[PDB]
């Protein structure tokens, strides 16, 4: 009963932390109703607020303990750290606020909560830190108490209670006020009394050149200092800062202010000191996606009311081009590393035109470019546009490779969407021609590729880098002479190492090289070679990269006698898929091993084996273990109630992998009782169970299946529904 | 869940080897079709066997896939089965270490775990003693789990037919056969055989055996030839379909790795002879691999409905078709909608002034649960949920069962028919896939095999036609079934499935009008001769070729089964006597050639009489002639039956039940065939008289008895010899009197004389 409660609560917290639902004001209500939902019988106990906060404290600490103490059994390079940073952010940011506006400011309850923990967590944390590395080794408990001090929750005499008996902390040194302090140009800590005004004032005077070249922290801009010093922000103030961006960003879309839109996207993309992760950890990524995709979709109507007959048009067109081009880079970074799908948001919001959405089909075909150039895709049945489609290709090739200048007429007559596909087409044709031997002059091309770096033509580089590895992978296996190979690097180095960069293109060029760097580095090392890796490692070191082996980035001289793994999930012959899933069967059945409570290592494992084979190889294999060994935890093989709770562990886990939000549960109950519902959950178990339920019922009318077999299958189905309806999601 | 696409395999010789998952003592089963009482059919008794990795000297594992070597022009007897653990067990049938055996007895070649040679003849489980073997379930998908198995053909060429058209000028159907040169990868003659298997981890295997040795060799590689073993053991391929391409020694390993969520393409190259300058030094083939292309799948349709990849089946396309690029049929299902979309892609090189070009999209109204590609037929089968099957042709993706309705009749070639399915013979209400363990359309598409959970025996469903009351469609149907066998013989298929389907339609015809059904047989078998460019109205030179032809062993067998229900009818009797005369032909002339060579061996081997080899040679000379005596008794007993009917028919010429006597004499080659038998009989007796046995008088009994049985026959052979000779001359002058080609068919098959030639019947 207690074990059931703790398992259910740990999996519930893990799922809710993954699902970005911390910002939901229903967190405490669901956490309180967990106890009543788990026990079918009525449990009418008045749980006081201190009890709720204490339960949250030990639940979070034990969950983090298991999360960090299950990592040694993983592969040493099966690196997934998004959830680790997510735990850190939650425990250091939200729980202090949960106490702040949920607690009664009782110092005793905090002492009881942090004194009731086992020493196993402390021993494991210290052992792991020592193995990774006396040097200052602070734990997550110190950061928890420090945040409470800034909120006036506890006096400065409380931190000394939990400190080691030999080392104290000076009370005066610890910050005690929640006011923003920034180092000015003269070194005086200035008080930022107003947050929104500070952002807009700095944003207006912000320079796009100061993004990556300003390695030093002594920058005159206060806002840029905050990004590199993001780890020390006050607990309550960062919520205001995150909310400040949202209100400012939504207003910029309404007013069509192109200057501030492009600058904002540059800060968020690079993710200095884990800046972008905290943003999703406060606003829901769905709402952020909706406004962001509205701009990229509704921008079509904005080009029919502007006439290029003013000297500010070239300023505006560059401002328009960069505002649109940067907004694309924000989506790709979110989709690739942060695990968000563009298709899902369109289904949830009916106001998005799926069939007429250019963004949706662009991302899914990002690494692949069409061999033919089409001005419009929905009207391929017409030939009038195809006549001038070839005209555009020859017009751009002659002007950029022979004339050496870009006429203003070409830019005005073409849209950004055609440019996003025109640039990959031309570079592919030139690069392919060079490789075969059609093009033999390099020097004219080196200057030619310089024109792709202008602010007007910046959006055309997004698809250029993705195609490179597919181009390079064939090159790696194919036999290419060094004379051609050194030429390929010469043409490539022009895009990689420009001689000069404009004040609006230097940060953009680094940003695009950061999206698809990792697979490029692996292919390049398989072979003027060093500068490309030197440039690639330089752009990889500007900010941390998630789920990457740090040995790969700095493998210049380190030789640990262990082969590097470039992927999130890695498998060897010594530890094949059999051993891990046999250890999963030992955990799916007897809850052995230590790979559980790790949805990083499990969700990817499910996909690698597919939900069908994952469920098929465990459901029917359970009987063999059950028929011989028996139900663990009971010394008597009497009754099926003991085995009933064991089945609840397996079915409750599958529910969370299917249901992700609150209102979604109320609609899946109607799916079972019988269009838009199953669209979002193509790979869910619920679809697989329901599609077989209706199909075998059809055979029941025709009588090709025994009645006993049909009764067995519905037993699994009704159990899934029964827990779905009795538990609130 | 996906069905068992490779759980069962119909061997080209009729053996149905399928996986067994219910018996606790066996994992494989063998059976075949047999006739109950000449009319009905039943499957043979299941011959259960047990396969475990430790047959070389104990728990056995489940069977993953069964692949008969029926690909291309291979003999189709060497069965190699791969278990769930990844061990490839090769079983040879029809051969024993010491002698030759029938097709229902198995034998091992080698076992893989390292590979070793151990020849051992397997025995059935039921006959074997109770052994200590339990069904251990390998519920783990190992790195060595073979995804797709493919066989390698030899350098032999295969000749098949593509289609037939109705020649309205002659009001007859015409077919053209085109030779198919080998395409893809083929193993040289000096290698006994070769095979390829792709494992789920990406590791590849290449088993081969040298024709001059018994030891087996294995060469293994991995697809992802990276410098790190971290990614070597990561390629968990969901689908790995190997389609040979027209490129020399190349196989397109179309794989879909969910790790990178892209349909990656590969190319595999093999050099059979590394050192062509040293033919004597047989070097191991070298294996090479080269990455080519990778693409991402489309998320949505045109109208805004998302898609999910259900299956990735690429068709094995030869160079015959207009665009030889293989069709990558990525199936998608629109969720909560009965529609199912099948997007088609083709791989083509990138041209200057590779890539995947999208041709079109095809929408199907029902969800698909299984896809099986037909062999040597170019037919993709869509096993929908409701049991209906819609086979789309590879050429145009036009439905075969509805092609006639939508065919543009006007043109030079009309009524293009490729299979009996084009006529309209649609399968009935098949059992629902949830209850079905596995399905497989029969090779001729005439019926479907269904294995049921509660049925201990395989079922069978045939094709039915709703408009059986319309008499005008008999002309098309007979021609459609005529071409069904034409493809089967060229592919050396038994085509027992097609025989059952033809009889059921004939039976329904005979229930209403018995007269109509008889004409259906005559028209049906006539089209076979036209399709194969063999003419029973040709001059006598071609007639000798007909007797030695294999098809008469099968085309005559057709009426042996299609005419069984007709009691007291001579349609089957006429075919059997000619067929048995062929067996009678193999008796005398089969040994007349053998006996002739024994004459020369006597003279040249007369210089060593005391050697221990001549004594056995001498004994065998006079023993062989003894075994012919029982055959000669039936030979005399046969000619008396026809002579007896002569006396009976004279008194009552109006008896229709004794019309078989007319056809026997009417057959043109039979009169010559018996004359040839009488000729060699005279030659044998003359040779025996010229060269009698003198060393041992006791051995002369067999030679003397041969002379006695001929002289003591109740009817003199010389008088009977002139009987058939005179019939031939009279039946030739009648052809010049009036030209007719149906009389040749009538005297050979119908065993009757047309009413327009009633005067000819009185002469006999």
From Swiss-Prot, chain A:
UniProt key word Transcription: yes
Top-level taxon in the UniProt lineage: Eukaryota
GO biological process, one term: positive regulation of transcription initiation by RNA polymerase II
Any one Gene Ontology cellular component term annotated for this protein: mitochondrion
Primary localization class, coarse: nucleus
GO molecular-function term, one example from the UniProt record: transcription coregulator activity
Record keywords, A-Z: Activator, Nucleus, Transcription, Transcription regulation
TM stretches of this protein: none
Keyword Transcription: yes
Protein's cellular compartments: Nucleus
Family: Belongs to the Mediator complex subunit 5 family.
Other known facts: Present with 2491 molecules/cell in log phase SD medium.
Function: Component of the Mediator complex, a coactivator involved in the regulated transcription of nearly all RNA polymerase II-dependent genes. Mediator functions as a bridge to convey information from gene-specific regulatory proteins to the basal RNA polymerase II transcription machinery. The Mediator complex, having a compact conformation in its free form, is recruited to promoters by direct interactions with regulatory proteins and serves for the assembly of a functional preinitiation complex with RNA polymerase II and the general transcription factors.
Subunit description: Component of the Mediator complex, which is composed of at least 21 subunits that form three structurally distinct submodules. The Mediator head module contains MED6, MED8, MED11, SRB4/MED17, SRB5/MED18, ROX3/MED19, SRB2/MED20 and SRB6/MED22, the middle module contains MED1, MED4, NUT1/MED5, MED7, CSE2/MED9, NUT2/MED10, SRB7/MED21 and SOH1/MED31, and the tail module contains MED2, PGD1/MED3, RGR1/MED14, GAL11/MED15 and SIN4/MED16. The head and the middle modules interact directly with RNA polymerase II, whereas the elongated tail module interacts with gene-specific regulatory proteins.
Protein name, per record: Mediator of RNA polymerase II transcription subunit 5
Lineage: Eukaryota, Fungi, Dikarya, Ascomycota, Saccharomycotina
Gene (name only): NUT1
Whole-protein residues included: 287 to 1132 of 1132
From Swiss-Prot, chain B:
Top-level taxon: Eukaryota
Compartmental location: Nucleus
Designated name of the protein: Mediator of RNA polymerase II transcription subunit 16
Family: Belongs to the Mediator complex subunit 16 family.
Post-translational modification as stated in the protein's UniProt record: Phosphorylated by KIN28.
Gene Ontology CC annotation, any one: core mediator complex
Gene Ontology biological-process entries: cellular response to heat; negative regulation of transcription by RNA polymerase II; positive regulation of DNA-templated transcription; positive regulation of transcription by RNA polymerase II; positive regulation of transcription elongation by RNA polymerase II; positive regulation of transcription initiation by RNA polymerase II; regulation of establishment of protein localization to chromosome; RNA polymerase II preinitiation complex assembly
Function field: Component of the Mediator complex, a coactivator involved in the regulated transcription of nearly all RNA polymerase II-dependent genes. Mediator functions as a bridge to convey information from gene-specific regulatory proteins to the basal RNA polymerase II transcription machinery. The Mediator complex, having a compact conformation in its free form, is recruited to promoters by direct interactions with regulatory proteins and serves for the assembly of a functional preinitiation complex with RNA polymerase II and the general transcription factors.
Record-level Gene Ontology MF annotations: RNA polymerase II-specific DNA-binding transcription factor binding
Keywords: Activator, Nucleus, Phosphoprotein, Transcription, Transcription regulation
PANTHER family membership: MEDIATOR OF RNA POLYMERASE II TRANSCRIPTION SUBUNIT 16, THYROID HORMONE RECEPTOR-ASSOCIATED PROTEIN-RELATED
Gene: SIN4
Entries under InterPro entries matching the protein: Mediator_Med16, Mediator_Med16_C, Mediator_Med16_N
Subunit record text: Component of the Mediator complex, which is composed of at least 21 subunits that form three structurally distinct submodules. The Mediator head module contains MED6, MED8, MED11, SRB4/MED17, SRB5/MED18, ROX3/MED19, SRB2/MED20 and SRB6/MED22, the middle module contains MED1, MED4, NUT1/MED5, MED7, CSE2/MED9, NUT2/MED10, SRB7/MED21 and SOH1/MED31, and the tail module contains MED2, PGD1/MED3, RGR1/MED14, GAL11/MED15 and SIN4/MED16. The head and the middle modules interact directly with RNA polymerase II, whereas the elongated tail module interacts with gene-specific regulatory proteins.
Any single Pfam family the record assigns to this protein: Med16_C
Main location: nucleus
Misc note: Present with 1720 molecules/cell in log phase SD medium.
